[PDB]
Design an enzyme around this catalytic site. Structure first.
Site, short mmCIF file in Angstrom:
data_model
loop_
_atom_site.label_atom_id
_atom_site.label_comp_id
_atom_site.label_asym_id
_atom_site.label_seq_id
_atom_site.Cartn_x
_atom_site.Cartn_y
_atom_site.Cartn_z
N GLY C 53 7.64 -1.16 -5.74
CA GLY C 53 8.73 -1.84 -5.07
C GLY C 53 8.74 -3.33 -5.36
O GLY C 53 7.71 -3.94 -5.63
N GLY C 55 8.95 -7.05 -3.72
CA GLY C 55 8.32 -7.55 -2.51
C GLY C 55 6.86 -7.85 -2.64
O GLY C 55 6.28 -8.33 -1.70
N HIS C 56 6.25 -7.60 -3.80
CA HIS C 56 4.80 -7.90 -3.99
C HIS C 56 4.52 -8.97 -5.03
O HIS C 56 3.40 -9.11 -5.52
CB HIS C 56 3.99 -6.62 -4.34
CG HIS C 56 4.45 -5.39 -3.62
ND1 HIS C 56 4.32 -5.24 -2.26
CD2 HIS C 56 5.03 -4.26 -4.08
CE1 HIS C 56 4.83 -4.07 -1.90
NE2 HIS C 56 5.26 -3.46 -2.98
N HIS C 218 3.16 -2.91 2.11
CA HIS C 218 4.57 -2.65 2.41
C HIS C 218 4.93 -2.95 3.84
O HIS C 218 5.94 -2.49 4.31
CB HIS C 218 4.95 -1.19 2.15
CG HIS C 218 4.71 -0.73 0.75
ND1 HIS C 218 3.50 -0.20 0.34
CD2 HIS C 218 5.51 -0.74 -0.34
CE1 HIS C 218 3.57 0.08 -0.95
NE2 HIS C 218 4.78 -0.24 -1.38
MG MG Z 1 9.11 2.49 0.64
#
Ligand code: MG
Ligand code: ADP
Ligand code: ADP
Ligand code: MG
Ligand code: MG
Ligand code: MG
EC number: 2.7.1.121
Lengths: 211, 356, 356, 211
Positions: C53, C55-56, C218
């Site tokens: 994803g 966001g990291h 997350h």
């Molecule tokens: Mg997810």
């Protein structure tokens, strides 16, 4: 004749240690509104170190004690107030030098020379919203007291009380020097931290001279 | 509150120890505290020194290494270091070729670094100074302490660090720093205040639709509190201010080591103009996601193109901070081929590293 | 709310564009989105690919370059990318020597990367896989989805990236990754939750004396909510958990490209032990001050010494994040001289850069 | 005889677009408590894309529409639910194939084959706290309805109502699969997002079949 002894000066500085500890958070809050929230800590750290070195030198001459004090503050307070208050004490010590007590007249000269040092290092003018807005009125108080041949203790009582009004007078100024000058008109409505420190110092001198 | 600290009195002791442990190349000195390259003094090179309060990590200690600083003086949090620390540190790093002090323009940094410069001169050390005042937020030096030194300090420490390493003289180093200071431009905004370890309350509070515009690095409010609406809006206001406040006149003092005295120098800055080439630094003030800095860069490139400016290099990251502040600053430094050559030259520091 | 974004739908478009603009070495592909080295395909080398994803940041796109990833697939925020994106990206980077997929252990990453591995095989592409499950917080795989892949993914991408660059074969790469996966150990804590751009509320709330202990990347709550007291306390609990949860047994599937089928492999991990040598990564989860990470390192070195572990290298910084989360993770990866040699080998990525 | 037409299946999927848009935030909140707060967005993004591609294929065979739908979801939903719901539709399409309408019996087989796909990809068992805790009861409902020769519309009405209770039944389970399994006993007290999505899908099928 009316004089301020070396041990009263020691007592003064010792009381500054106490006041800068007690009012640490208050000075911090003043420097939070129009600064970086460190002034209280700086003054506490500085006078805390001064007051630790003091007992080892309580028996030297006034010039010696004041000059070490200024040098101690310099090596420790940091930021804008470190060099400014360091210079105050260093220039005050060269007015004094090997005294064992001080007449009103010599006190006036001492404070006059100290302040002249802070003014030329920092360039503050009246209304810039700095510690100089307290120093200058304080010096002029000492001058007047000297003209009037007041006793040393009531001279300092009047200088102290003038320092109070001068510090308060800063609330209303827009800053033109220091960190607060970066806030523009947002500096209006807030008391200068450094001017408050001078006020506290003068209040402790009046106390030290009472006997 | 809620900081990853132990006792407040020990935070810097613990953090600096961790720095020295992590970095074989760095020496932590004690009594007085300061930090140097483990291989300083390096004979034959101008030595580059700087310093300032703790709380802006990695500036300055993250920049100690070949091609950059020879040492740095961390002060207390948000507190200029004292003249004895700068003096001992400069003595420690002196390479026979002079010492250059890089000083960010704050009343405290100026006064302490000045007291130190004189002590060095009086010790026979050849020394001079560069003052950094890139922050355009404080528009006018007439009735203020002058513009603040913020993130451009990093770009200048790198470029001047490259010249010092190339073998350039004290004077050519100083003149290079002062020229770059004259065409570097920064501005910062905060969406959320930092909290210093001794505090338990943030340096200022703010509603969800508000920002501190024209912030520096010590957590003071900025030049105004204004609505926050979007990335594009925020970046547009900042950029437009880089241009309109680009013109600047003021006096900066530098040490004349020949005279042995402070030399006032009245100097003027031009706004960046169509046809200039720049290095762009998009700088996290401490708690902005890297992803958002890339979003900022996207917009900045558009505004640069529109204004006739060509970004030749960039840095995007956390380079000059304010503890845990949510915000960022933009710095645009005008360059030429010779300055680009110094940019690309090797640098080996904890925060910056390439080449060689 | 309060993010530096424009319209929610456009955040990744704007951020990825900014990434491509900042980085001459990176190519942004469209329809489907993914990112590659501008000079891929590189003939003659195993190609290293990963993804996950958004966001990291910087993981994974900050790790695209020589010595590391050949490309990466960013998904939506906190959302595994889809098999078509991974498929196209791997096709794009294929260097004739095979493609290695590095997959963090989440149900979604596993399933999507698996679907993609099979598509690649069926296209004639030689391919295999390494699964990362370094997060020790979820103690037991018996009645859970298995341990999460967190910050150790970075250390493994670097080391395996070095071997791929050294000229090592697909198999020697895979076996290297799987061995390292077996002796790398991570744990994270949060003092404050992240907020995703579409949200206006944080992923969890927390009192000033509380922490989320055993968090991943997350933004989910960790394995428990417990009192927060000090840096030393926090780091001690984390470290003690690295050791007590060090033992781990589970099944990881890897693609057998010869069979053309998934191979279960039951494998066990040992806790780190007295006499092991490690690389330590002290990783900002997004909004912790660098200074505090150094304070964390100070304590970690003490605990390592006490437990008989020798830290040979370290990284301290923001390497594998969770948007604007206030917290950090500690990763200890056991090494030997041959692994250290791969650590020191050149790497040229946006986030990591040295040598050569 | 009682059957489910191709246009009713189109109508079903179209209604899913609506429900996944309307309940986006609700599903998101469910995946906030025991996940990473993305499920709603994933389902919305997926069915939103499905429902856009749908009018161009509304006249192909049921197997065609279901298989494209599964492939569309796969290319778009991402995360854990993308491959799981993609597989459901792909395996459902190969049960179906070139149909133009479906008998109860073929519906049952279709749902039976779909779910078998999600179970072997994900390995969830009853009580693991996943979408499989709704699929399995739903399939067994369809089986029973088929035994009893119910009409297709009331069969789906009963499958839907069973899906509701099955989704609710998840609140109470400790998760053993998915992201929620990382929270341990903290996953108890919270409804599974994916199971809720299956419930919504079944509720829309009952609606689609009413006429
Ligand atoms: Mg997810
Ligand atoms: N140019 C100056 N001249 C005289 N006093 C000054 C000047 N600049 C700042 N000050 C004094 O310094 C005080 C702030 O001190 P402090 O907070 O310790 O340093 P800093 O601003 O570096 O944090 C101000 O309140 C002001 O009285
Ligand atoms: N192994 C599995 N088998 C069946 N369903 C699963 C499994 N893992 C997760 N799920 C379903 O996925 C849902 C979460 O989906 P979503 O949030 O879209 O993906 P992610 O967990 O990757 O963010 C869960 O609520 C659960 O129903
Ligand atoms: Mg201050
Ligand atoms: Mg300060
Ligand atoms: Mg999710």
């Amino acid at each position: 004749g009316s004089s301020l002894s070396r041990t009263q000066i020691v007592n003064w500085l010792t009381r500054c240690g106490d006041i800068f500890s007690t009012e640490s958070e208050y000075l911090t809050g003043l420097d939070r509104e129009i600064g970086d929230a460190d002034h209280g800590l700086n003054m506490n750290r500085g006078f805390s170190k001064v007051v630790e070195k003091l007992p080892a030198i309580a028996d030297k001459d006034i010039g010696f004690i004041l000059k070490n004090t200024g040098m101690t503050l310099l090596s420790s307070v940091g930021g804008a107030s470190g060099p400014l208050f360091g210079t105050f004490f260093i220039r005050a010590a060269q007015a004094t030098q090997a005294r064992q007590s001080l007449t009103l007249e010599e006190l006036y000269q001492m404070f006059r020379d100290g302040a002249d040092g802070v003014i030329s290092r920092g360039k503050a003018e009246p209304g810039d919203k700095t510690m100089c807005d307290v120093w200058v009125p304080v010096v002029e108080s000492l001058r007047q007291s000297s003209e009037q041949n007041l006793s040393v203790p009531v001279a300092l009582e009047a200088a102290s009380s003038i320092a109070e009004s001068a510090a308060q007078s800063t609330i209303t100024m827009q800053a033109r020097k220091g960190r607060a000058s970066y806030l523009g008109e947002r500096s209006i409505g807030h008391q200068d931290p450094g001017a408050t420190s001078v006020m506290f110092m003068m209040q402790m001198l009046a106390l030290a001279a009472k006997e | 509150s809620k900081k990853l600290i132990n006792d407040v009195q020990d935070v810097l002791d613990e953090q600096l120890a961790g720095l020295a442990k992590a970095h074989p190349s760095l020496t932590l000195h004690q009594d007085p505290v300061y930090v140097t390259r483990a291989d300083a003094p390096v004979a034959g090179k101008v030595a580059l020194l700087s310093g300032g309060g703790s709380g802006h990590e990695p500036m300055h200690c993250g920049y100690i290494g070949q091609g950059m600083l020879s040492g740095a003086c961390p002060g207390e949090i948000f507190t200029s270091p004292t003249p004895d620390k700068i003096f001992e540190c400069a003595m420690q790093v002196d390479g026979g070729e002079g010492v250059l002090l890089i000083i960010k323009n704050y009343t405290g940094d100026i006064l302490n670094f000045e007291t130190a410069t004189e002590l060095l001169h009086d010790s026979g050390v050849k020394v001079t100074t560069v003052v950094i005042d890139d922050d355009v937020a404080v528009k006018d030096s007439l009735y203020t302490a002058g513009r603040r030194g913020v993130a451009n300090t990093v770009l200048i420490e790198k470029l001047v660090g490259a010249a010092a390493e190339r073998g350039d003289s004290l004077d050519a180093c100083a003149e290079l720093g002062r020229k770059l200071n004259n065409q570097g431009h920064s501005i910062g905004i905060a969406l959320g205040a930092c909290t210093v370890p001794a505090a338990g309350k943030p340096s200022f509070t703010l509603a969800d639709n508000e920002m501190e515009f024209g912030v520096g690095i010590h957590g003071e409010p900025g030049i105004d509190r204004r609505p926050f609406s979007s990335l594009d809006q925020t970046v547009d206001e900042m950029f437009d201010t880089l241009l309109v406040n680009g013109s600047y006149h003021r006096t900066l003092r530098f040490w004349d080591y020949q005279q042995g005295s402070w030399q006032e120098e009245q100097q003027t800055k031009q706004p960046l103009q169509s046809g200039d080439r720049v290095i762009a630094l998009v700088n996290n003030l401490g708690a902005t996601p890297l992803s958002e800095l890339y979003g900022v860069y996207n917009r900045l490139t558009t505004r640069c193109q529109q204004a006739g400016l060509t970004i030749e290099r960039n840095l995007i990251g956390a380079y000059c901070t304010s503890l845990d502040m949510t915000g960022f600053s933009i710095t645009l430094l005008k360059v030429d081929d010779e300055t680009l050559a110094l940019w690309d030259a090797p640098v080996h520091t904890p925060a910056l590293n390439w080449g060689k």
